[PDB]
Amino acid sequence: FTKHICAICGDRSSGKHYGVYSCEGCKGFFKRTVRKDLTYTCRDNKDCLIDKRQRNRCQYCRYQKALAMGMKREAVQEERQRG
Ligand SMILES: [Zn+2]
Ligand SMILES: [Zn+2]
Numbered sequence: 833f834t835k836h837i838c839a840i841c842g843d844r845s846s847g848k849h850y851g852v853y854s855c856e857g858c859k860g861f862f863k864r865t866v867r868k869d870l871t872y873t874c875r876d877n878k879d880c881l882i883d884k885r886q887r888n889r890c891q892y893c894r895y896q897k898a899l900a901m902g903m904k905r906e907a908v909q910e911e912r913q914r915g
Contacts, residue, residue, distance in 0.1 A: 840897040842884050850903035857888040862898050865891070866908040 836845040836853040843855035850862060864870075872892035874880050880893035888894065899905075 839901050840894050841882060841886055841888075841890075850898070850905065850907050852898075852901050852903050854903075858894060858898070861888055861891065861894060862903060863908050865895055866905050867912065871895075 833839075833853065836848075837843070838845050838855040838858055839852045840854065840858055843857070845853040846856050846859065847854065849859045854862075865872075872895060874890055874892040876893065878893075878896065880886070880890065880896075882890065882893050882897055886893065
């Protein structure tokens with residue numbers, strides 16, 4: 833968005849992580865998740881009420897949101913390019 837709020841949780845973004853305005857928690861979290869190629873769950877339905885309140889504890893839903901917008905998953909493998 834104009835004001836670079838974190839596309840996922842509405843936090844202040846640090847940069848366009850994986851091509852989308854994102855915050856530090858999300859930066860690392862998404863990287864970890866993708867590199868490991870993990871999946872999670874939350875104590876809510878898939879349509880979890882994602883807002884500022886939902887800290888990075890809400891891994892699953894943050895990941896769903898990231899995927900929904902379409903964070904450039906592949907870019908996570910940058911450091912994995914051990915040429
Ligand atoms: Zn975030
Ligand atoms: Zn959730």
